[PDB]
């Protein structure tokens, strides 16, 4: 198995959203990942590409034998991932303390939205809920409209799976000097708050307000926003630095002397109207051409179905073909121990086989 | 120094965006982080809480002495972070090959948007540019409007700094076997693409379309979206699973018999009209009460300024106070080697004093 995490052994108790994602990335980077699902759900080779780089086994964890088989896996592993509500693994007899008896070296990684304790800790929830409570969701969207969810990228993945990964891998490093595992408590409401630390920094220096649509990076700034083009497609402009901003104006054909200052916020509506008219006068592809090799920070906004046709994407092999279609290659990339292309979701294998394999 | 990364030594070539965010989190978790800025840059103690858990030092890397003091720090460190365009560290004589000659244990961490090669590798950009090229930005916002940037959360941080962190820490694990460092190439265009791997999976199985605002998780579903309340504030609804959805309906006072099926997408206009009118009939804090302790997946949409009053936030200490504003405590959390509260930004330190200490 190629990648820096060759020889890492991971047991994943099947769940949804962040835990599978973290498991995936571990797998991507060459960890040996064994996913325990319940026999009721698994039937067929799974067509969820998020289950790439896995061995799937079934086991009724509520049975004596299913529990037993699972504790045998965990005894042989470096990391356990679970994404259930607090208390769930404990009642299965798979809680931290039961695991520490069979393996004091285990990294015990708990992925929740609300955390291990506190008043919301038993509430069901999804991404949109976790980001609503800590200020993030309120800050996203246009000012005249209700907030819009940024898919499930910020709570589940950015502020979720990624912090679970950082914790699993930091704990493995700590283990090298201590000889011992420990519990990683990754809550999406926490991770996503660190994810957005820059806004909390800016609010304290009076450089970010709670008004939606009125900030440098939320779409309020005319030089950091999307613009509709003559063909109804979009460009993105991200020209924060005055040098880049100047370059954009020149390529739009706009004389900086006729315009309000870049950062005079009271005249942003006026500046935006001038840029809107300019961008609207040619199609997206025209602007992509005009600004190629430029520091103007103007890029075409591609839909998923167009990404395979973009030279920069193709030539760096950001994607590989599978399946129905394209999927992202592992990230990040490593010079010496490089990841390989992901292995598609495997047939269900028997849990005893795995134990043989793992002695 | 508290936390799981106690003992880890980090050199950070001062940049913007993902690089400092990654360096912050390493510091947050106990790493010993030393940040080399240019002198034509630092003018007192920093106002920027992202530079917490750091020692700051000054050095003209274009001079011979600067270069050599920097190579001395790097010789004694576990990790280097740089987020300049490709070729900047090479031309400075701090490239990977040069560092490899003074410390072959080094994790050499390169944070870019476009990557180390290819047609766009030299173009300036920010978060919005990197997520524009890989399909992400186009998927964010209402169907009746142009795409809206999800702040800089998805390219800079989720798909940038966090992938840099994973790379660094994965390479440290690998170094346990090999006794050798290596280069980590973290590009925002790649990391953000793995961040959205779900949508690429669903797209393949016909469960996600390229039409903005017409999917289960983008605002198209009436049961996964925000709703304006009587007071003009908002709640979030995330009631995907039928049992949570049924719990939401009961709290709203709508009988299921009077509504279209939850997932009959052809009747989503009617369903949205019904939910819209119901949520609009009381204020946000009403709904927050009704649904607390519930599996209805209805939560108040709080503004930054109100977060510090939310019981669940207060009690788990998600935030700490510092310099006229709250900031987030480190994440994730560790049972035995807990992180401590972050140290504020300090006055600059002498690069010699650091080499000594090390
Ligand atoms: C649509 C998805 C994409 C979007 C996802 C997001 O936006 S974020 C993802 C969702 N949020 C989270 O993941 C946060 C943490 N998880 C949760 O809050 C919760 O798991 C949930 C709300 C998602 C779902 O609540 P549920 O009540 O279904 O599940 P819960 O986690 O409480 O308990 C799961 C039950 O399955 C049982 N169980 C698990 N594996 C088993 C196995 N192999 N064999 C037998 N039984 C098994 C456990 O023993 C437990 O039983 P008991 O009944 O005895 O206790
Ligand atoms: C907080 C602001 C916004 C954050 C929100 C976002 O979306 S941020 C995402 C930003 N994008 C990235 O970080 C992606 C990768 N980085 C970049 O593309 C680029 O750094 C950039 C476009 C941000 C900025 O381009 P510039 O052209 O300013 O800088 P570039 O990195 O090419 O070169 C840096 C220059 O500084 C010099 N340099 C750096 N440190 C030095 C030191 N201590 N003493 C002397 N010289 C030093 C280098 O030698 C080089 O100069 P010479 O060329 O003269 O030799």
From Swiss-Prot, chain B:
It comes from the Bacteria. GO terms for molecular function: alpha-methylacyl-CoA racemase activity; protein homodimerization activity. It holds the Pfam family CoA_transf_3. Development of gem-disubstituted substrate-product analogs as inhibitors of racemases and epimerases is elaborated using alpha-methylacyl-CoA racemase from Mycobacterium tuberculosis as a model enzyme. These non-physiologic substrates could be used as a therapeutic agent to inhibit human AMACR, which is overexpressed in prostate cancer. Signal peptide: none annotated. One of its GO terms (biological process) is lipid metabolic process. The active site is at residues 126, 156. Catalyzes the epimerization of (2R)- and (2S)-methylacyl-coenzyme A (CoA) thioesters. Accepts as substrates a wide range of alpha-methylacyl-CoAs, including (2R)-2-methylmyristoyl-CoA and (2S)-2-methylmyristoyl-CoA, (2R)-pristanoyl-CoA and (2S)-pristanoyl-CoA, and the cholesterol esters (25R)-3-oxo-cholest-4-en-26-oyl-CoA and (25S)-3-oxo-cholest-4-en-26-oyl-CoA. Can also catalyze the interconversion of the non-physiologic substrates (2R)-ibuprofenoyl-CoA and (2S)-ibuprofenoyl-CoA, which are potential competitive inhibitors of the enzyme. Belongs to the CoA-transferase III family. This is Alpha-methylacyl-CoA racemase. It comes from Mycobacterium tuberculosis (strain ATCC 25618 / H37Rv).
């Amino acid at each position: 198995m190629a990648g820096p995490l060759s020889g890492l052994r991971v047991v994943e108790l099947a769940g949804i959203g962040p835990g599978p994602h973290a498991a995936m990335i571990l797998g991507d980077l060459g960890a040996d990942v064994v996913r325990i699902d319940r026999p009721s759900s698994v039937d067929g080779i799974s067509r969820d590409a998020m289950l790439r780089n896995r061995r799937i086994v079934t086991a009724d964890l509520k049975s004596d034998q299913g529990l037993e088989l699972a504790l045998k896996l965990i005894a042989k592993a470096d990391v356990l991932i679970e994404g259930y509500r607090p208390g769930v693994t404990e009642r299965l007899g798979l809680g931290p303390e039961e695991c520490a008896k069979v393996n004091d070296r285990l990294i015990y990684a708990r992925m929740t939205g609300w955390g291990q304790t506190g008043p919301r800790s038993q509430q069901a929830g999804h991404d949109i809920n976790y980001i609503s409570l800590n200020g993030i969701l309120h800050a996203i969207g246009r000012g005249d409209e209700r907030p819009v969810p940024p898919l499930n990228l910020v709570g589940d993945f950015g502020g979720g799976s990624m912090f679970l990964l950082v914790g699993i891998l930091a704990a493995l490093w700590e283990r090298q000097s201590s000889g011992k595992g420990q519990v990683v408590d990754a809550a999406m409401v926490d991770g996503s708050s660190v994810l957005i630390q820059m806004m909390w920094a800016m609010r304290a220096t009076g450089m970010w307000t709670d008004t939606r649509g009125a900030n440098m990076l939320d779409g309020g700034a005319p030089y950091y926003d999307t613009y509709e083009c003559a063909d109804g497609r979009y460009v993105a402009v991200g020209a924060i630095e005055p040098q880049f901003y100047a370059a954009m104006l020149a390529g739009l054909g706009l004389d900086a002397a006729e315009l309000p200052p870049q950062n005079d916020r009271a005249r942003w509506p006026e500046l935006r109207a001038l840029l809107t008219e300019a961008f609207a006068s040619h199609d997206r592809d025209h602007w992509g051409a005009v600004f190629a090799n430029s520091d103007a920070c103007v890029t075409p906004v591609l839909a998923f179905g167009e990404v395979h046709n973009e030279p920069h994407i193709i030539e760096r092999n950001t994607f590989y073909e599978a399946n129905g279609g394209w999927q992202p290659m592992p990230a990040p990339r490593f010079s010496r121990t490089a990841s390989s292309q992901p292995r598609p979701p495997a047939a269900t294998i028997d849990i005893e086989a795995v134990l043989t394999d793992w002695d």
